[PDB]
Design a binder for this molecule. Sequence first.
Ligand SMILES: *C1=C(F234[N][C@@]25=N3C(=O)C2=C(N=[C][C]3[C]N(C6=[C][C]=C(C(=O)[N][C]([C][C]C([O])=O)C([O])=O)[C]=[C]6)[C]N32)N54)C(=O)[N]C(=O)N1[C]1[C][C]([O])[C]([C]OP([O])([O])=O)O1
Ligand SMILES: *C1=C(F234[N][C@@]25=N3C(=O)C2=C(N=[C][C]3[C]N(C6=[C][C]=C(C(=O)[N][C]([C][C]C([O])=O)C([O])=O)[C]=[C]6)[C]N32)N54)C(=O)[N]C(=O)N1[C]1[C][C]([O])[C]([C]OP([O])([O])=O)O1
Lengths: 264, 264
Amino acid sequence: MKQYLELMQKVLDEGTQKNDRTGTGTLSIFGHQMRFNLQDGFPLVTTKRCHLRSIIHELLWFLQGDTNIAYLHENNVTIWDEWADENGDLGPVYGKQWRAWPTPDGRHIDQITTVLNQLKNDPDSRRIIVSAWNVGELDKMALAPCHAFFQFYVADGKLSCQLYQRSCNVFLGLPFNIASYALLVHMMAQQCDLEVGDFVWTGGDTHLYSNHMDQTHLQLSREPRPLPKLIIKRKPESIFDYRFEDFEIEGYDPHPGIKAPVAI
Amino acid sequence: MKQYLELMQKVLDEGTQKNDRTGTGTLSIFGHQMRFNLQDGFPLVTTKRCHLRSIIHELLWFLQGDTNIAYLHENNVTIWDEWADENGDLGPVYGKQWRAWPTPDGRHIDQITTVLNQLKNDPDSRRIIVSAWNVGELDKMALAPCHAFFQFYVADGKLSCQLYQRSCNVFLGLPFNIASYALLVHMMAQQCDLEVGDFVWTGGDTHLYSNHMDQTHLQLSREPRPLPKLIIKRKPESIFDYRFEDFEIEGYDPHPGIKAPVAI
Ligand SMILES: *C1=C(F234[N][C@@]25=N3C(=O)C2=C(N=[C][C]3[C]N(C6=[C][C]=C(C(=O)[N][C]([C][C]C([O])=O)C([O])=O)[C]=[C]6)[C]N32)N54)C(=O)[N]C(=O)N1[C]1[C][C]([O])[C]([C]OP([O])([O])=O)O1
Ligand SMILES: *C1=C(F234[N][C@@]25=N3C(=O)C2=C(N=[C][C]3[C]N(C6=[C][C]=C(C(=O)[N][C]([C][C]C([O])=O)C([O])=O)[C]=[C]6)[C]N32)N54)C(=O)[N]C(=O)N1[C]1[C][C]([O])[C]([C]OP([O])([O])=O)O1
């Protein structure tokens, strides 16, 4: 994608050297914002082949407030294996915060339902927010949430959403994060009889690992193809009733995939 | 400021009509990001006279974890009067979340101290975050926090900070919010022996009230003057030891002030 390649180049030309928790150096910039008009096509990277399969399962998994990787396994999705403990538990990560943020007085807040309510009864609200950054539960999470905060906005019958991503591996994670949140907006919009608007992506520490330079230069030489189109086969009863088969991507013709090895 | 006037114009030319909780219409845009190189001067609006006095007191008040307006009153600062209850209490707003985020298990997390620790012992961290968006305590706050989340970043001896502001009254509140957070960065940097870097401002629902159009056009006709310089008279023992008199602004020559009436 045009906006995507632009950021990659930006990190290359303006990034400063910084090491991550391990030892792998990164080229890093702080503060970046992109905008994807969802009406312009589904924001799935075409400069390299991306697979929607894992993305869909993870999203549906988040929505069920599940934090154990069993569901993902039943569907052969192994993107969380690396973080799961012996029992397949990841701790109170995303799904738990989204569907059951625990209060000091013993309640569990359903932020997803709260948001659905607001979009339907008070679309003009400036508080339609979902936060996964529960300070009191950070110590128990397999890892602190990267995409930690997102806000919805309604204007002229169009639902928009801004995501704040504290840490972003441009080459490996961003393509996945964009499609994931773009899917969420389509689902929410359908459930609220709204048209899709913009998906604004905001990042904090945006970076590229030093050992991904070749892959970056390679991808940057490819010309972005037209964006595909997301097809939602049916309109479920609620946001919690979507099924993997309900989605279909039309017109996706990307360039070959590109491997990105990680150090350990 | 150049970046500031640019946003005002942007809201004017691209904002859509949207009403707020009351009935006052607003011109609104969703998703905007500005960057202030703090090395370039203190980001205090010169196209209209701004008073640092209330800004400093509020910041020092936030840092003491105080949520009762008494301190502000002892110093004749009345910006919170409007929201305070009979006893001067505002509920678990900013100061409380910053200094004592309550956990489900009975602990109170000091996010400000946590951040100081990270900046000194792990400056490369991508988790140096302070959140005031405590979902479980929203119902008790006089109002949901506008500037709800901020993140620090260290690179080349420079401390940077990104603020996410969910709702932003461009004319009335933004000038205040920028200076407030810019002050925080100078204080934090001093305490960590770091140089000041960038202050990145990210907004969600950025707007202008319909009854502030004249004032907006008027301010937009003024030429931004050079930015002043922030002087910190002394280096306190800790971040919690600053005093109003410790700050001094040098070279501030703004245009006349501009009143902005609000409907009720
Ligand atoms: C962070 C991240 F975050 N928290 C979290 N979340 C999520 O979601 C995740 C994680 N982890 C891991 C998991 C999985 N993932 C993924 C997916 C995918 C991938 C790949 O590789 N792929 C690609 C393609 C895609 C498509 O298909 O499209 C290829 O192959 O190439 C990877 C991964 C998800 N999950 N965790 C996110 O999200 N993001 C980001 O960026 N992050 C990161 C940041 C950094 O780099 C790290 C961390 O560090 P700190 O310090 O910050 O913590 O990570
Ligand atoms: C929101 C806001 F927020 N939450 C909160 N925080 C704060 O901080 C505040 C509030 N409120 C009020 C108070 C006070 N303030 C202020 C200050 C100042 C001002 C003025 O007026 N001033 C000017 C000047 C300045 C200087 O000096 O510089 C003139 O005069 O002109 C005003 C105000 C502060 N505090 N609360 C913030 O911050 N911001 C914003 O923007 N916000 C807003 C948004 C909107 O508009 C509203 C709300 O709604 P919702 O729905 O969103 O909630 O508000």
